[PDB]
Each structure stands twice: as C-alpha cells, then as structure tokens.
Design a protein around this ligand. Sequence first.
Ligand SMILES: CCCCCCCCCCCCC/C=C/[C@H](O)[C@H](N)CO
Ligand SMILES: CCCCCCCCCCCCC/C=C/[C@H](O)[C@H](N)CO
Lengths: 245, 245, 283, 283, 46
Amino acid sequence: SDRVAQLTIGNSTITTQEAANIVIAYGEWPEYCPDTDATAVDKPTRPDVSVNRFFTLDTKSWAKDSKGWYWKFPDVLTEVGVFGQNAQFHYLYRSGFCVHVQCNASKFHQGALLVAVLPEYVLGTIAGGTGNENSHPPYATTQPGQVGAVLTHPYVLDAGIPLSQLTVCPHQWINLRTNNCATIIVPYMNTVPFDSALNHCNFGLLVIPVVPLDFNAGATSEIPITVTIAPMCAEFAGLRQAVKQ
Amino acid sequence: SDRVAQLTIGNSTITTQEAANIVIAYGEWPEYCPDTDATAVDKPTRPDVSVNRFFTLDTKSWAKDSKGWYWKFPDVLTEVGVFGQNAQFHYLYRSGFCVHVQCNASKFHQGALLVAVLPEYVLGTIAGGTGNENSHPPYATTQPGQVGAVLTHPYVLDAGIPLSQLTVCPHQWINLRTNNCATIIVPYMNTVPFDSALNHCNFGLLVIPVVPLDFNAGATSEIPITVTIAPMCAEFAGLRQAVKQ
Amino acid sequence: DPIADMIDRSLTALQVLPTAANTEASSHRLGTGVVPALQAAETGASSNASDKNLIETRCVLNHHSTQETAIGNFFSRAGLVSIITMPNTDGYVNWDIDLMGYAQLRRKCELFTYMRFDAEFTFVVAKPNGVLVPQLLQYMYVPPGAPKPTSRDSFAWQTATNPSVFVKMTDPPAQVSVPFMSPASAYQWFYDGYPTFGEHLQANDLDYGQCPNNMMGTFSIRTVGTEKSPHSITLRVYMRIKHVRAWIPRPLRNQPYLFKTNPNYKGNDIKCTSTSRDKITTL
Amino acid sequence: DPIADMIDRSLTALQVLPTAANTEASSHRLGTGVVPALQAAETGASSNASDKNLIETRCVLNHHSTQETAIGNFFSRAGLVSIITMPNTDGYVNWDIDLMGYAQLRRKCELFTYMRFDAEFTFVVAKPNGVLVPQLLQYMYVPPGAPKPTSRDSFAWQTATNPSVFVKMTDPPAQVSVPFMSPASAYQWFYDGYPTFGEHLQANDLDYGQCPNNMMGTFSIRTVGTEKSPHSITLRVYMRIKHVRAWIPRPLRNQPYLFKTNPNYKGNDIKCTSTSRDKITTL
Amino acid sequence: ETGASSNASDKNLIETRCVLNHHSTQETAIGNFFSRAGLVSIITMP
Ligand SMILES: CCCCCCCCCCCCC/C=C/[C@H](O)[C@H](N)CO
Ligand SMILES: CCCCCCCCCCCCC/C=C/[C@H](O)[C@H](N)CO
C-alpha cells in the first residue's frame, strides 16, 4: 500500500506503481533563508510557480557494458525554462532540489543501479598517465550541461575515492526485480547562504551500474534511463543584465 | 513644497525638483485581480520585484518642426528585461503602469508638450489618398517596439478624431517655463481580466508638441525627450514554451 | 514568523444630484494670499473657480433637472441600421450582422469605448415604392457555427432550434428582444491588435482590428413558398438600446466614414474641425 | 482578505549517549507475519535488526565509553605540515600558507567536507643534523594584501602592525594560537567550480578548484642580523586543531596523492582497495 | 554645501528585507589599533 506514489509540484505530476520510499537527504526539508542567516540587503525575488516544477532532461541508453554517467547541479537547468532566465539575470540564487530517476524493465531482465547524490564532486585527471603532469579537466568535462558526461574509471569515481563506500552519501537502489524508480530530496548545502549559479556547482548526481544488465536474446535490448528533477524553494537576488557564462 | 517629488519602486528611484502633481487615471490604484472576477483556474505567478521597476526607453530629439510620437503598450517592454521573458513564456498577463516623461530646457526657451494616455488607440490609413482603397497599416507601424513611431497627420491623430478634445483622456502638460516632467499612473483597463501580450495592445501614449519650440540663435539647439515607465502589479499565468510573436 | 518580510484607496464616491446646484450670495473681497482666479492647467485637473469667487452674485434657487442627460435617455431611441432588398434574386438573402453601416448611429456608439446593453429589434417591410401586397415572410437568426440555408427550400428552414418569426406584410411590424450575448463582459468598438497568433504579413494585414467578441453570426429572410414570388421586397431594421452601461469616453469623430470595419479616412481633404472666418479680431 | 490564495519538520533530534547500549534478554519465538530478519536495502536505509531478534541473548550491562570516538579527541593532535630550510640563500624565505603538503594530515581532514576550527601552531627549529647553535630568529605572519619583505633588511621587518615572534634556538619551542579567520562560515576542502567570471579556456584551466576563502597569505622567517649568518637552518611546523565542528562526511581516499592543489592520481597503476587473494572459497 | 554628511540609508532609496547582523566593531577601537609593538630605533656599538 506504499508501493505506489504521486508527487505533484507546479503544474506537473509524477506517478509510479512500483516505488521504494522517499529519501530526505540528512533529514532536512528545503526552506527559505531566514533573517538570522541572511547577509544580502536587497529584497529577494521568488517566482514560486514557474521554477518549482518538474523538468525532464535527456534519455541515456543502458547497454550491456556501460560505465556510468554524472550530472552537475544546477548546471543542468541553467539554459532551460524561466529558471534558465532568472539564473542568467541575477547574481545570487538559493534552491533545493528533488531528483527522480526512472528506468523500467520486464520480469525477465536483471541488473542493479546505484543512484547517489554527492556534494562538492571535484573531478580529477589521470595526470598524464605516468603521473608527472599537472593536468586539469577542461570546461566541457567539468560542466557538461543538460546532456551529462560518462565516466572513465568508475572504480575510483575519477576523483581518487573508491566506489565501495559511496553509500555514506544519501542514496538509493534501482533493482530491476523489485522497483523501477529512485527519488532523493536534497536541501541547500553550502558554506554561504547565497551563491552564483554560473561559477559554482553544488553537488553531482551519479548513476553507476554495479551489477551488469543481462537478458536472454530475443527480449527488448533497448533499456533507457531518464532523469527528472525539480527545484523546491528557489530564491534569487542581485539583478544585473544577462550574462550566460 | 510640493514642487519636488521622488518615486521609488523596485531597485530604481526617480527624483525631480520642478514637478507638477501626480495623476491617477480615473482615480483608481492598480491592484491584483480578486477572486470574484477571476476565470482562470491555474495559480498565477508574481515576480513582484524583478518586473516592478523603472525601465528607460530610448531618447528622441525635439526639433523646431516636429510632429509627434507614439508608443504602444506593452509592446515597448516585451523584448527587454525579465518582463520581456515572462511575457514570452506565458499566455496571459495583467499589469498596471506608471509613465514618466522627462524633457528639460533653460529659462530662455519656450514650448509646450501635451502628454496623454489613450486606451484602444486603433490607427488608420489615408485610404490611398483619394479614399477608395481599403488600405491597412503594416505590422511595423501598428507595433513599433521600444523605438516608437512618428505621426503623419497629427491634427487628426491618424485615427480620424481631432486633437482639440484629446484632454478628455488622462493627461498632463509639460510647459517649458514652469516644469520639466509629467507623470501618469494607469490601472488595468480591459473587458477581460487577463489577456495575451503579443496580440493585444491596451493603450497608446502620445506626446504631441502643441506650441512649437523656439529659441534665439546661440542657445543649446539639442532638446531631447526621454520616456521612463514601470509596471505596477504584474501577474502572469498559463505557462508554455517561448514564442516571441 | 521566521521571515519578517513575508507577513507584510478610492478617490471620490458617487452621489445623487437630482437638480442643478444652486447659487449662493456673495460680496466683494479685498485680501492678500488667497486667490481662486489663478490656476495651473499643467496638472491636468480642471479649474474649480465658481461664479461667486470672481464677481458678486445673488441667491438663485434653480430647479433644472438633469434627467435628459443620462445615458439611458440618450441612447433609447430606435435608429436605422440596415436596408435589405430582395430584387438575392432567388428569394432569400443572408446578411452578416454588422451594426456599423449607417453613420448616424455609429457616431453615437463610438463616443464610448466599452458598452454593455440589451437591444430591441423592429422590422418594417414593404415594396420599394411603399406599396403593400399580401405576402408571407419568415425571418431566421443563425448563430455563429450553425449551418446556413443555401436555397429557398433548404433543410435549414425547418427551424428546430433557431429562433424565428413568421409575419405578413399587412400586419403591424414585428418586435423582438435580444439579451447581452458576448463571450467577454462588454462589447468594444475598438480593438488594438490582431485576433490570431503567428506571423503577421501583407496577406493577413486585414485582420487588424477584428475582434471575435462582436461577430454574432448572420441573419436570413425568405419568402415562405417554394416557388418564385413576383414582388420585390425591401426590409428596414431598427434597433433600440436598453439597460445601458458605458465606460471610458473618447473624442468624437470629425471626419466622414469610409468603411464599416476600419477608421480609415480620406487623406486629401482633411476637414478642419471648425468653420473658418476671415480675421481674428472681427467676428 | 480579498485574495484567498495569499494568506496561506525535523526528523530526529540528538541526545546524549555516555555508554554503549546494553543488551536485554530474549527467548525463542515462533509466529507468522512478523519478520525482522528480512529487510530491503533498496530504500537506502540501513537495517535495524538487533542481536535479540535473531538469536536468544542474555542480559549484559556494558560500561564501554564512547569518548575516544568524538571529533574533538580525534583531531586534537599536533601533526607535521611543513619543512622550511634556509641553506632562501639570502637569510629569508617566504612560504605560502598551504596545509596540504603532507599526506598523513591531509587524509584525516579530507574525511569531512566543511570544517570550522581554531588552531595552535608550534615551531621546532634546529640545524639540518639536529645540532644546536645560539642564534636569534624572527617569524612574521603576513596577511593577504600586505606588502612582503623582499630582502633580509627590508622595511617590512619593522612589524608595526603584523604579529611577530622573536625567539632563540636554545629556547623551548614557540607556541601561538590562531582564531577562525575565513570570510565564509567554514573552511572547505573541495570547491567544484571556478572562482572568477568570464570565459574559461585552456590558459585559465588551472583555476578549477581554487577557493579564495582558504588562501590566508604567507609566512616569513629570517635571521635577525643584517649580515650573512654562517649556519643552515631548518624549521618544522606543527599544528593542533581545537573546537572542532564538521559537516557532511565523505569517502576516504585510497589512491596516493600527487599534488597539493588537485585530486589528480596516477592513471596507470590504479590501486585496488583490498589486498587480493587466490580463491573465493579458501581464505 | 553645509558641511554635513548625508543621512540617507539603504531603505529610503530601494526596497530592502530585514537583516539581523552581529558584526562586532571591536577591532576598530583605538585601543586595539595601537597596542602593537613597533620598531623605533636601531643602536649599534661598533
Ligand atoms: C429574431 C431576432 C434576430 C435578431 C438577432 C440579433 C442578435 C445580434 C445582436 C448583436 C448585438 C451587437 C453585437 C456587435 C455589434 C456590432 O455589429 C459590432 N461591434 C461590429 O463592430
Ligand atoms: C604568528 C602566527 C603565524 C601563523 C599564522 C597562521 C594563520 C593561517 C591559518 C590557516 C588556517 C587554515 C586555512 C586553510 C587551510 C589550507 O591551507 C587550505 N584549505 C588549502 O586548501
């Protein structure tokens, strides 16, 4: 009786019939910034309907030998919708999020996905192979946009930390024999109450296939993955002309 | 002690030291639409800071033989600022306005301007000169944008009504020996509570020089005119992808 | 109250005036500082100087009523809106409802911007020389979207839903009452913009000023019989206006009309508003 | 209230636990429907099955304290952060403050994301073979923006505002206390983004991950005299951490470090996290 | 021209929110500004 779920916010609604429970990251709901922690003096703007809604990104293809994908937040939403406009005409933003990942398969397939939200995901290089080069990741790798990039060495997450203890972050599983979706609610986590949206990226969302996808020949060999996200309590301040990046 | 004035709204402030009084058109303040007159069911969005501020348009040049200029509302603001974005991503809008026109000259010049706000300003043609053609104004004439167009036959206002009784509309004067500014506050006047911003234009603002500008040779022969406007209680509804026109 | 930011006037009201205002007595006055004769027309307010502040007046009780200047008595008069002739030659006409075909009623209704009213229509019908011949006629009102009759004996003349009148030529003229039937809250005689979306070009330039809240369908008459009647018919339609409410007055038109759909004027003979004289000093 | 639209929870609170939780007695159980041994790890919650729900247990009162596992006792130990040598040859060195030069303290501090603390610095100084020679030294802390000394006898060594210590080699080691001095509310060891605006290119690609809320200026020592001292000096700096508050834990690094500013690793020898064995069935 | 400085605050020019700040003014006192030892003399005996 808790396997079904419905999330509505804005003018959008997500329904699921085989769903796990809802994960609130660190047990805190997202909220507007109180006066005791505020430092900016200008009155903030709250669009409160046109930015608090479900936005659907692109769709990846799960093969039999896939590595994994990552999206940087809120770089994924900075060119779409009115949230793409308020983040271009202002200097400061502050918002929570609500991530929902869908991937469905039949009763004859098998596989397991590990979804996880990781804050301050700083990428690294392989340092020129032999380890003597002070290499740096380019701008296309660190901030891919709403497409998202693939992983190269997923055992070390391309940052030197192992996959084996990634579950200390808020996380869920998409096991193909029980459920087909995963959902996390993330509050705003930063050292400063407001920040720029074009030079700072708060967290990264990682989808890594631990158990490989396997099926017998003849079944539907096209397994897609689709990510859907929604800001929660977005505020903005510091108006200035449009600067994209 | 009432010759000075200060208007602040948003993050903008207009000051004047030789000003006439403030005109409220038909004695009504602009306001949000109540529930007794509403027909749309979706919850409206109110940006309430980023669109309630003073926007400054371009600057015309008053010569010795000028005819007059007109601006169509809210066509002037539909490509600038975040108000240019919310009017492109929605289907319905509703807002008041506050018009402020500045034109200053010294104590040795003379002239008189008649500012007036006219609702449902439908333009016409000269019908092919001899009057047998069913001519129509083009799209560049009826909706000029934030530049504004000039008048051709100002005695009939290019609509068949004479200039001599234009003062029945809300209006003010800019007489160059007393003041240098004029200000009108217009509420929302339409038969329906919400409307589209790309297919309907509520009112027109007319600036017509009744008494011609005259001075002796040697003075500053460059007299500019600058219009500054500000929406008051803007609401929007009916979200859809961006359509410019 | 965690956020101290989120917690957070009409000018004049109307009154009844049955008669014109009286005139109170006054005397002379000599003083400094107070001056009602000097105004400032720059603020857009009209002057408030009365008679007693400029000259000395007596006391006059007037009982002049202001009844004839109300908008109800100004508009409730039947005026001609249409002339419809059946020489068309097949015994039926389909006339599109447009009440801007005759200039005397168009000038009065264009004095206001928005209007809301109920009408009352009257049909006076005879031959083109006033002659009378006994003849049976049928009127039928067709709403927008309904099928229209294409012949004298079509299936649309069965009038299973449509309102219709059957009347003879020798009878007194027919009269009907029509309620306020717009999708909007009031009719408007001016619409600044285009009715549709999309690109506006020189092929679609005639759309400018056509509001669909005023298009009310069509109107159809016919002779009743299935054969060809041998007489020419001419219909005249008169419309009264009841329960009037108006909004936002406008300047009146001083140029002669050219078409029914747009305010176009003749561009060569721009008529001056006043009749010209010779000198400024001699009347 | 003209608009009816405008008028319009923490999960668990903390508690003190001085000792580890006791174990209560239990018995066997035979029943249907109730099952604590079956869980679902898919929801991201850890299991809540205790010992008594799987086997039968006795009663054990334990008094094991959890004092050593607090974050205050875990971090308040002085560790080496710098080795500074004066063979540089002009009797002075300017060392930029960066506490990520030695891997044993870098691994402990990178376990958390945000940290807020006050430090305590200690300077142990001798010759490069441990030998002792009587010698006068001066330390000077230079905040970011302040002028730096460029010579052994510059005007920056007058220390009119700067905090400074004068200490000899034969003395006990010097100790100071430093408060929390960041412009933000906490230090962070990871910063995903660029510090500046504008275009990011291959010339400015090294800006990625450099947060200016952690750059604290520089540090300068010198021999006091105006001439050239004849001895080689070597300084070792040890830092304790007091009044610790931390936020948002992270996985620990299992690859060896390469530079002080970025998490780059060697891409050829990816070290497996566990030590490998031969067979899965034989330990 | 009168030699007095202006008294216009933030709230009289733009619209502001409510901000409770706890920034102390201790470091700007004259006691903390001057109580630091500085060099005044170099005296040599050759
Ligand atoms: C048996 C009754 C038949 C008569 C039916 C009459 C109904 C139509 C009444 C229309 C009321 C006025 C609507 C608009 C008037 C003008 O034609 C438009 N504004 C044109 O601009
Ligand atoms: C006379 C006292 C001289 C000592 C002055 C020490 C003040 C500097 C203390 C810095 C506190 C840590 C700030 C940042 C630490 C790391 O270097 C950065 N996070 C580098 O990532």
